[PDB]
Design a binder for this molecule. Structure first.
Ligand SMILES: *CCC(=O)N1C[C@@H]2C[C@H]1CN2S(=O)(=O)c1ccc(N2CC(CN3CCC([C@@](CN4CCC4)(c4cccc(F)c4)[C@H]4CCC[C@@H]4NC(=O)OC)CC3)(OC)C2)cc1
Length: 481
């Protein structure tokens, strides 16, 4: 329910008023995910979904304030609007789940209870809507339009469990999928949403098969297990400032940035690598005085992945590579992509890993070829003269090759082979042969660049990659075999 400590912070007439609600809620023993999700969804609806201020609606008002280059109008989050939305969600869940039929074995939720709550959210959703549609992530979307995206369903099941008083059910997250963790010690797992366009319904099952398979989608078991404070962080990361494909809401960007600094200062981003990359992206768009630089924050994201997730995360390095690409730091961008491939090499490319395959396919066959083409234009009256860039390029392909090893389906096809030959060809023979590709001589220690290939394909190509005249057919045949 909604208590006086929560209600007295209403109405929310500004960005700072919303931040104050979150600061107060994060200080409570059990932060209300439902209330916080509804507020974000309410403000996102008028700032990005439908910006046209309503004429025939009398209770709904907007708050004017000076905009940095006339006025800007903020949707006033009234207590009557939010409390009614909150009451509707609570009434729906409590009315559909009869907790007398489920024996709570000393504050522990059974699989049967978790599956019922999952079924309630699932059966409430609209029969037909676009899944990749923007702004269908919040509980406002579930209540006002019965639409939720893939990870939104997972968050809604967790929100609904908290409303029923189930403190043991928590959000589990990978870098592209969401499920729930429950039971004593939070070692019990259950699928609550779908994944992919048409990849069937594994709802109600454990994630064991996906973890044992070594797919990037289940991160070999080193996935995030959220506490209530991390579920608030997920919800803040989930804020979508997009108005259309090319424009953003300046208020939603400012709100997400302020909310991320709030979570950071309380230490709730310490185990959330992608939130730190998101904050760094926001800091580059609008730096806030006295705060650390985007580069410091990207490396804080990588450090978190290394410390708490045994360096098995892809996107922290991807975020850093993104920064260097935008700023045209060819060496530093290629280094970060090679570091991404060093992570993916110990995974097996499975059917449902399309999201990360598409990301690597685009860097290897569009982004990197575009970078080296632009660099070649600049040489006609520098990075292509650096043998370190060439070593980063080879380590990147080494990672993709090793990733393909032990995989049920191939990664590299004729489409990749062309861009490898073209990218190798962007570096002169003299620059390419400066790189020493060694296996090592002695193991351990007693009391031009150097590179070691972990993959069979790049090892067999060793001499060809360094030869003055590139044998295209042989390099293409070995990469695609
Ligand atoms: C020169 C620059 C250039 O051309 N390019 C091309 C691209 C961009 C730039 C550099 N390259 S790149 O190196 O190939 C590259 C860099 C960075 C990224 N991205 C990070 C990104 C995606 N995040 C991953 C997490 C999601 C998540 C939604 N997913 C997307 C499909 C569904 C999600 C997270 C976890 C579990 C999930 F099930 C889903 C959302 C759901 C709600 C919260 C969550 N987001 C966060 O946690 O945010 C921190 C989206 C964010 O960020 C934009 C793209 C890719 C390539």
């Amino acid at each position: 329910g909604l208590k006086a400590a929560q209600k007295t912070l209403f109405p929310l007439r500004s960005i700072d008023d919303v931040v104050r609600l979150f600061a107060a809620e994060l200080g409570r023993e059990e932060p209300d995910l439902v209330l916080l999700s509804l507020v974000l969804g309410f403000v996102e609806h008028f700032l990005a979904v439908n910006r046209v201020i309503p004429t025939n609606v009398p209770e709904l008002t907007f708050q004017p304030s000076p905009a940095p280059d006339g006025l800007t109008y903020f949707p006033v989050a009234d207590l009557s609007i939010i409390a009614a939305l909150y009451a509707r969600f609570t009434a729906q869940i409590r009315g559909a789940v009869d907790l007398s039929l489920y024996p709570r074995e000393g504050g522990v939720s059974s699989r049967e209870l978790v599956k019922k709550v999952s079924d309630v959210i699932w059966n409430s959703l609209s029969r037909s809507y676009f899944k990749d549609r923007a702004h269908i992530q919040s509980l406002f979307s579930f209540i006002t339009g019965t639409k939720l995206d893939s990870s939104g369903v997972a968050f809604a099941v967790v929100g609904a469990c908290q409303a029923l008083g189930l403190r043991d059910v928590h959000l589990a997250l990978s870098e592209d999928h969401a499920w729930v963790v429950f039971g004593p010690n939070g070692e019990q797992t259950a699928e609550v949403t779908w994944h992919g366009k048409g990849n069937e319904d594994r709802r109600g099952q454990t994630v064991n098969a996906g973890v044992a398979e070594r797919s990037w989608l289940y991160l070999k078991g080193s996935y995030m297990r959220c506490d209530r404070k991390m579920e608030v962080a997920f919800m803040v990361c989930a804020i979508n400032p997009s108005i259309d494909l090319h424009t953003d809401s300046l208020e939603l960007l400012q709100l997400q940035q302020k909310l991320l600094w709030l979570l950071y200062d309380l230490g709730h981003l310490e185990r959330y690598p992608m939130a730190l990359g998101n904050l760094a992206d926001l800091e580059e768009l609008e730096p806030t005085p006295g705060r650390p630089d985007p580069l410091t924050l990207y490396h804080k994201g990588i450090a978190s992945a290394k410390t708490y997730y045994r360096d098995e995360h892809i996107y922290p390095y991807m975020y850093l590579a993104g920064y260097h690409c935008r700023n045209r730091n060819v060496r530093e961008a290629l280094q970060a992509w090679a570091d991404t491939a060093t992570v993916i090499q110990d995974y097996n490319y499975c059917r449902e890993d399309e999201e990360i395959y598409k990301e690597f396919f685009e860097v290897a066959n569009d982004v990197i070829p575009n970078l080296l083409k632009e660099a070649a234009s600049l040489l006609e009256a520098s990075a292509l003269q650096d043998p370190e860039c060439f070593a980063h390029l080879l380590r990147f392909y080494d990672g993709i090759c090793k990733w393909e090893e032990g995989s049920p389906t191939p990664v590299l096809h004729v489409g990749w082979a062309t861009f490898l030959v073209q990218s190798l060809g962007r570096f002169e023979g003299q620059v390419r042969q400066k790189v020493r590709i060694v296996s090592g001589t002695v193991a351990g220690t007693a009391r031009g660049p150097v590179l070691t290939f972990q993959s069979e394909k790049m090892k067999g190509m060793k001499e060809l990659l360094v030869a003055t005249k590139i044998n295209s057919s042989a390099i293409k045949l070995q990469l695609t075999a």
